[PDB]
Design a binder for these strands. Structure first.
Ligand SMILES: [Mg+2]
Ligand SMILES: [Mg+2]
Ligand SMILES: [Mg+2]
Ligand SMILES: [Mg+2]
Ligand SMILES: [Mg+2]
Ligand SMILES: [Mg+2]
Ligand SMILES: [Mg+2]
Ligand SMILES: [Mg+2]
Ligand SMILES: [Mg+2]
Ligand SMILES: [Mg+2]
Ligand SMILES: [Mg+2]
Ligand SMILES: [Mg+2]
Ligand SMILES: [Mg+2]
Ligand SMILES: [Mg+2]
Lengths: 127, 226, 62, 42, 25, 97
RNA sequence: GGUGAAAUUCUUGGAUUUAUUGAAGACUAACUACUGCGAAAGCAUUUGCCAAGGACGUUUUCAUUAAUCAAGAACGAAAGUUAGGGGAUCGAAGAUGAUCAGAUACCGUCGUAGUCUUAACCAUAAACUAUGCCGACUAGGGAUCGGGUGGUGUUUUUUUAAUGACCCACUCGGCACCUUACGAGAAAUCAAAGUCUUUGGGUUCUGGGGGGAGUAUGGUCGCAAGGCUGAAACUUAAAGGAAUUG
């Protein structure tokens, strides 16, 4: 009875991506990030811009036919910060109020088998 | 950040969802649920041939959804589209995986992680890479707090596991392997054959990935659906 | 113009560097028994009733 | 801690389903705890 | 001065004196 | 003088330790000297559990977790309200609170 | 995208994001610890081969073959050099954006040499335990790694054997640790930094106020960069160690 998509929240710092693809992932619906809802360039990763983006993905999912969704939270990963940004819990919360149905929350952060090299030098990011 | 794009075009509106229409996904018969979900493609025009557009899609689904029971909650399964027939496309097995929370829950410190992999080919000339995991366990009555293995126990355990996995594959075509992985029966005789060496808890084996496939042989897939 | 009324049930403490903003948790009259945390500019007491232009908010310390 | 976890879902109160639509709804997902005989006679 | 950069400064000075003396020889 | 007996670290019979990078600034710090921590939180913030319980399609769903191991350098740990500074008699206390 | 905030940069030629593949090179996460091996530098994916090693066990053998060592020899992080290969990341130089009074810095984005390997050099390091090696004795406590001994001890196999994995006691060797100070020390502190004016177990190396100076010169090694050896004139009354109170 429920049509299931995949939420795919890229919860980084400096931005937050929400877009609901199909079950296969080849066909994508409703990609609105956090940067298109606030005019600061600083709070593109804020909880406000994340929840305003997550309200838009559910409006474009309801008018298409998506009723439920699977959630794959994501940090930057690789050699980078590997922890979720501030907008991850805001975007996940916002599309639960909007009418969508949640199943199978999961992280898909790219964790290496200690890949190439972090940037910043051996002395660090000196600030 | 709308008013930040200096230029939108280097050189200098039709809604596609009305064009789009829905299909449905069919799991193989070695799964208690056939209805997985629905997919979207564009309309089958005379020059793009929508059946070939959705031909090689890979669908991510959980085994708990495929079997109903929540005991196989981690256990992710790859399903690969192969054969489409009137909004009723069929899928075959493409691989199995663990969830990242289940893998990271198992890996704790003050215990020894043991990993084994094989590259054994099945009867249908399917070449599969099967991974195994195990953890040494603190026995009951044990006082000391770490319970490590002795690096020749590990090499004895790894040899036992790799010979078991390469034995259960030759003899299973593909559907026997899928009906062996679902009951988690593979984890049983790993535990039985390794209880001589070390206690070895947590043998939920690991992912298995496909490497190469033979020709189509569409009678085999309609045996999985029909 | 949707507005939402909430009732302060437990005062958490002051926030802001100069101390002018108070952390409170509030109980909504409509849609009873679901509670969030907000920030108050002025003097807020127990059983004060707040009106909010939006209720989709958690409070983080300033 | 590693061992602790929480459970979310429909079962985060049991009630009598007077409406047959509620009965048809409750049997559909599968939350029916018991079907008891009524106390009085027919 | 840092003892590393006095060591660097005299190493550069020795290179100048080594090559201003090779003019004669 | 010698501030610590182990001098910063846990290197006794090791020669070399093959360092790691700090999660905050990518500073190369030896693994024995690192201030390793484990951050284990739910997949869902605690203010959204009742929110997600009523929006889930499943009757019984076990909420998964994030298990991320953090390595800090000495400068970043002291700055980020971690092990920052102890008195000379409390420096020898090795027990976590 | 990045940031405290931005900008350089990429984007309607579809950037960022999603899916499916493929290729390349580096690395060997989580397990991973007051844990292991090695003379040190060092060494963490699987399996096969090659040769080596310590501890233990021994009612096996030789019989003083020993300890430390001028001269001399081998190995020796990283960086650097030469010549092929490789060249994904990161990134001395360089280029740019920002900040700034300046910013040829910190910060951002690119980016050569390098980072990897093969053959040959170099011979350095806060190469640190800032603590030479061999031998003996001197206070208590538990843990742990490897080997061994004992115990009708627990569990599993085939209730049951042998084993294995644990438990208790003991022992040899190892990485360490906790308490105390008989003892030492200027103190910090130290089971060695103790057995040192009640001054002798054996032996090697090194220092003699601070600069000038690891400079000049001369040898010698090195393709080079440089390494090893290494003064004097002159100047100076304090430099310096560990603790105390501000
Ligand atoms: Mg100091
Ligand atoms: Mg060293
Ligand atoms: Mg694209
Ligand atoms: Mg590994
Ligand atoms: Mg070990
Ligand atoms: Mg030296
Ligand atoms: Mg020295
Ligand atoms: Mg002695
Ligand atoms: Mg023993
Ligand atoms: Mg011992
Ligand atoms: Mg040891
Ligand atoms: Mg003198
Ligand atoms: Mg002198
Ligand atoms: Mg002083």
């Amino acid at each position: 009875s429920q049509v299931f998509g995949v939420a795919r929240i890229y919860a980084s710092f400096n931005d937050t991506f929400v877009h609901v693809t199909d079950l296969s992932g080849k066909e994508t619906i409703a990609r609105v990030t956090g940067g298109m809802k606030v005019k600061a360039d600083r709070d593109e990763s804020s909880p406000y811009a994340a929840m305003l983006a997550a309200q838009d993905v559910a409006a474009k999912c309801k008018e298409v036919g998506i009723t439920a969704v699977h959630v794959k939270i994501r940090a930057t990963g690789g050699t980078r910060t590997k922890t979720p940004g501030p907008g991850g819990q805001a975007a996940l919360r916002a599309l639960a109020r909007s009418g969508l149905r949640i199943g199978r929350i999961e992280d898909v952060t790219p964790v290496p088998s200690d890949s190439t090299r972090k940037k910043g030098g051996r002395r660090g990011r000196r600030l | 950040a709308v008013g930040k794009n200096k230029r939108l075009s280097k050189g200098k509106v039709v809604d596609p969802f009305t064009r789009k229409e829905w299909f449905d996904i069919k799991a193989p018969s070695t799964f208690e649920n056939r209805n997985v979900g629905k997919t979207l493609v564009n309309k089958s025009t005379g020059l793009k041939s929508a059946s070939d557009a959705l031909k090689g899609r890979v669908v991510e689904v959980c085994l708990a959804d495929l079997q109903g029971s929540e005991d196989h909650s981690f256990r992710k399964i790859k399903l690969r589209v192969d054969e489409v027939q009137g909004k009723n496309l069929l899928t075959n097995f493409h691989g199995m995986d663990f969830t990242t929370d289940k893998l990271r829950s198992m890996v704790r410190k003050w215990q020894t992680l043991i990993e084994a992999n094989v590259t054994v080919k099945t009867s249908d000339d399917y070449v599969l890479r099967i991974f195994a995991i195990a953890f040494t366990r603190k026995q009951a009555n044990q006082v000391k707090r770490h319970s490590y293995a002795q690096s020749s126990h590990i090499r004895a355990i790894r040899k036992v596991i790799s010979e078991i996995l390469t034995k259960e594959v030759q003899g299973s075509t593909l559907a026997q392997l899928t009906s062996k992985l679902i009951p988690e029966v593979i984890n049983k005789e790993i535990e039985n054959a390794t209880k001589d060496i070390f206690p070895l808890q947590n043998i939920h084996v690991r992912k298995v990935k496909l490497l190469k496939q033979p020709k189509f042989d569409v009678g085999a897939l309609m045996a999985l659906h029909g | 113009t949707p507005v939402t009324l909430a009732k302060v049930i437990k005062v958490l403490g002051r926030t802001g560097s100069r101390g002018g903003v108070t952390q409170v948790r509030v109980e909504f009259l409509e849609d009873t028994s679901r509670t969030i945390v907000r920030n108050v500019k002025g003097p807020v007491r127990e059983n004060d009733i707040l009106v909010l232009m939006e209720s989709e908010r958690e409070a983080r310390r300033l | 801690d590693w061992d602790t976890n929480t459970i979310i879902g429909s079962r985060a109160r049991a009630n009598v389903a007077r409406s047959q639509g509620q009965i048809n709804a409750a049997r559909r997902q599968g939350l029916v705890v018991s079907v008891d005989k009524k106390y009085g006679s027919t | 001065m840092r003892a590393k950069w006095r060591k660097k400064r005299t190493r550069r000075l020795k290179r100048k004196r080594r090559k201003v003396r090779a003019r004669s020889k | 003088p010698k501030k610590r007996a182990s001098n910063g670290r846990n290197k006794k019979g090791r020669g070399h330790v093959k360092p790691v990078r700090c999660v905050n600034c990518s500073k190369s710090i030896p693994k024995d000297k690192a201030i390793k921590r484990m951050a284990i939180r739910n997949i869902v913030e605690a203010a959204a559990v009742r929110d997600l319980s009523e929006a889930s399609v499943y009757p019984e769903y076990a909420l998964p977790k994030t298990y991320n191991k953090l390595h800090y350098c000495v400068s970043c740990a002291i700055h980020a309200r971690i092990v920052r500074v102890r008195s000379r008699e409390d420096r020898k206390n090795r027990a976590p609170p």
